[PDB]
Design a protein around this ligand. Structure first.
Ligand SMILES: *C/C=C(C)/C=C/C=C(C)/C=C/C1=C(C)CCCC1(C)C
Ligand SMILES: CCCCCCCCCCCCCCCCCCCC
Ligand SMILES: CCCCCCCCCCCCCCCCCCCC
Ligand SMILES: CCCCCCCCCCCCCCCCCCCC
Length: 265
């Protein structure tokens, strides 16, 4: 499937470093998700019943993430193979080829649940649960779908690639706007400690989620002839994605659990 990983792998190839590093950073990804899974399971008892749906959604996200990131990892290593002559790893015809599908599926599943789960920890004031939920779920699904559409043109048609990226961005923008409202309403009438944690959650959410569109554009951030437009851009992209995954899923989940506990007090 015509993507950048495959482009680079089929033309320049990947240095030992780029291929080993990338492989290791992916393994950390799914490793951390597994640890996260066990954490959210074990600690579920630490929060009042009325918050436990958040912990549950954390656990489920962990399952999803671990399975698909693990599959992704195996895909990476399988797709590229070493050539003694040039001393680099090249896209392997006997392999399945690298597939972004695993990640974009993970997003499709995880995005709704991550947005949903905060609604079980914080209380809204003037907004309706059902309104916020539907707005999250819709825009979350649209954002990933348009992104996925765009990813097809990454190499083929960099114009459409960006256009769909921008449409995706629009939906992203809508999500941020709703989450801002949720968090602000969540703060009213809770302890300053809780407000502290909600402030932190916002920042983590804002940064961690923005990493994704960053890694999506990563290869072209230096132009077509740029440094990033290479195995290094693949390296960077996958690193950032992995940093975003851990942040947006595990750390996000941890913080919500901590918020829940202060609200039990
Ligand atoms: C746990 C996985 C998460 C939270 C994935 C989130 C993914 C995004 C917020 C993706 C955003 C994108 C854009 C805003 C434009 C470019 C295409 C995407 C999908 C990377
Ligand atoms: C290894 C990283 C994932 C493990 C789960 C996260 C545990 C964090 C514990 C922090 C306690 C603060 C309340
Ligand atoms: C079903 C998709 C892949 C499952 C991953 C199982 C990992 C077991 C070894 C750790
Ligand atoms: C209240 C502060 C709790 C911070 C949560 C940090 C959880 C650790 C997860 C980081 C994973 C380490 C490797 C990357």
């Amino acid at each position: 499937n015509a993507n950048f990983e495959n482009f680079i792998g089929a033309t320049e190839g990947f240095s030992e470093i780029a291929y080993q590093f990338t492989s290791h950073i992916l393994t950390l990804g799914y490793a951390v998700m597994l640890a996260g899974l066990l954490y959210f399971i074990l600690t579920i008892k630490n929060v009042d019943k009325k918050f436990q749906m958040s912990n549950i959604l954390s656990a489920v996200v962990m399952v999803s993430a671990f399975l698909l990131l693990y599959a992704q990892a195996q895909n990476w290593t399988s797709s590229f193979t070493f050539n003694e002559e040039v001393g680099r790893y090249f896209l392997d015809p006997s392999g399945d080829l690298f597939n972004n599908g695993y990640r974009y599926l993970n997003w499709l599943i995880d995005v709704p649940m991550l947005l949903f789960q905060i609604l079980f920890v914080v209380s809204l004031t003037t907004s309706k649960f059902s309104s916020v939920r539907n707005q999250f779920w819709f825009s979350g699904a649209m954002m990933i779908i348009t992104g996925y559409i765009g990813q097809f043109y990454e190499v083929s048609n960099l114009t459409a690639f960006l256009v769909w990226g921008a449409i995706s961005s629009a939906f992203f923008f809508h999500i941020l706007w709703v989450m801002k409202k949720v968090i602000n309403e969540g703060k009213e009438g809770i302890s300053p400690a809780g407000q502290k944690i909600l402030s932190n959650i916002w920042i983590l959410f804002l940064i961690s989620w923005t990493l994704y569109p960053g890694a999506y554009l990563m290869p072209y951030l230096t132009g077509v002839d740029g440094f990033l437009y290479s195995e290094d851009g693949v390296m960077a992209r996958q690193l950032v994605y992995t940093i975003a995954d851990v942040s947006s899923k595990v750390i996000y989940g941890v913080l919500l659990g901590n918020l829940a506990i202060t609200l039990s007090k």
